[PDB]
Amino acid sequence: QECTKFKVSSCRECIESGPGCTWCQKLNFTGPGDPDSIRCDTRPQLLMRGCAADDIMDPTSLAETQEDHNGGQKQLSPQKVTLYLRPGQAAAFNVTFRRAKLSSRVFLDHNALPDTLKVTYDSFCSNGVTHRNQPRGDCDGVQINVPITFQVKVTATECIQEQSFVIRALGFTDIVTVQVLPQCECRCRDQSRDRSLCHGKGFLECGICRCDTGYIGKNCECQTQGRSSQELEGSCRKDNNSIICSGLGDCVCGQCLCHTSDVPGKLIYGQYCEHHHHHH
Numbered sequence: 001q002e003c004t005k006f007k008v009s010s011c012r013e014c015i016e017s018g019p020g021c022t023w024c025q026k027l028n029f030t031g032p033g034d035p036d037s038i039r040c041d042t043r044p045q046l047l048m049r050g051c052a053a054d055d056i057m058d059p060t061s062l063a064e065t066q067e068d069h070n071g072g073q074k075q076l077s078p079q080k081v082t083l084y085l086r087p088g089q090a091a092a093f094n095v096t097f098r099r100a101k102l103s104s105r106v107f108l109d110h111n112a113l114p115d116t117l118k119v120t121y122d123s124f125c126s127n128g129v130t131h132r133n134q135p136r137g138d139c140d141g142v143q144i145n146v147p148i149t150f151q152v153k154v155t156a157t158e159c160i161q162e163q164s165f166v167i168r169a170l171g172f173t174d175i176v177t178v179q180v181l182p183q184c185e186c187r188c189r190d191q192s193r194d195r196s197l198c199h200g201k202g203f204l205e206c207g208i209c210r211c212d213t214g215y216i217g218k219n220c221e222c223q224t225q226g227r228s229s230q231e232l233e234g235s236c237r238k239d240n241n242s243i244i245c246s247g248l249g250d251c252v253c254g255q256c257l258c259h260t261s262d263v264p265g266k267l268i269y270g271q272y273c274e275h276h277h278h279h280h
């Protein structure tokens, strides 16, 4: 899987970036030099970088199905389907058609949808014929008391608003009620059980500390006083066209904290972490 991203600053922005994108809510996951957007990546990349399973945010597209007491509907099942849709990721569910008297050929279709929703049908007919990824369900040679199966795939191009639509077999009063819901929000751990999180001077939002006014840093550890945020950054960059701590460190309250390496011999040092040694 692949994840294309650009300067993502929230869990939702990461999920909206593509079905292959996952978000790491792990505290202090972004080491010195690493921006918040590093938290957004493919799952095996985050796992490699030490993000645990309980810290990887990755909601998926899924289908929930329900049958009524079944005195209500004979030929189409299930009667109720709930879809949670993540943008770009298809949700699949099967609709069973059971012939009573009816028709030799059966078509499965849905009412008009917004352009943000894409629906295709696979047709697993009883006569051996199999259609895949069609705009409609289509099965000829349908016989009484031998069920046929249609696989419905629904894909949203965005975080859609909650809506419903129906799936019907042409020539029949039967209705499959389909409720669709967005799957774009992340269920992250909050601040409730620790007042020391973000030094108690900021809001914890999916691994990111949104520091209170007068506080900066990845953990809101630096109180700025009247010293401006840029003033403390100036002691961390060599010139005005350069990047803070040579992109290899964090500016911790006016001073660069350099990235430490596990690679033997590697040492990142200097006022701006500008010395990259291979033989230390």
Ligand SMILES: *[C@@H]1O[C@H](CO)[C@@H](O)[C@H](O)[C@H]1NC(C)=O
Pocket (backbone or CB within 6 Å): 027, 028, 219, 221
């Ligand atoms: C996160 O890093 C900060 C260092 O600024 C540390 O004080 C805090 O205990 C860390 N939290 C963890 C490891 O959960």
Ligand SMILES: *[C@@H]1O[C@H](CO)[C@@H](O)[C@H](O)[C@H]1NC(C)=O
Pocket (backbone or CB within 6 Å): 092, 093, 094, 124, 149, 150, 151
């Ligand atoms: C639908 O049914 C077909 C054949 O019975 C099966 O191959 C497919 O996995 C089913 N789809 C789902 C989502 O269960």
Ligand SMILES: *[C@@H]1O[C@H](CO)[C@@H](O)[C@H](O)[C@H]1NC(C)=O
Pocket (backbone or CB within 6 Å): 240, 241
């Ligand atoms: C220094 O660089 C910053 C870039 O964020 C810019 O906003 C600022 O105007 C620059 N200062 C001068 C004197 O060029």
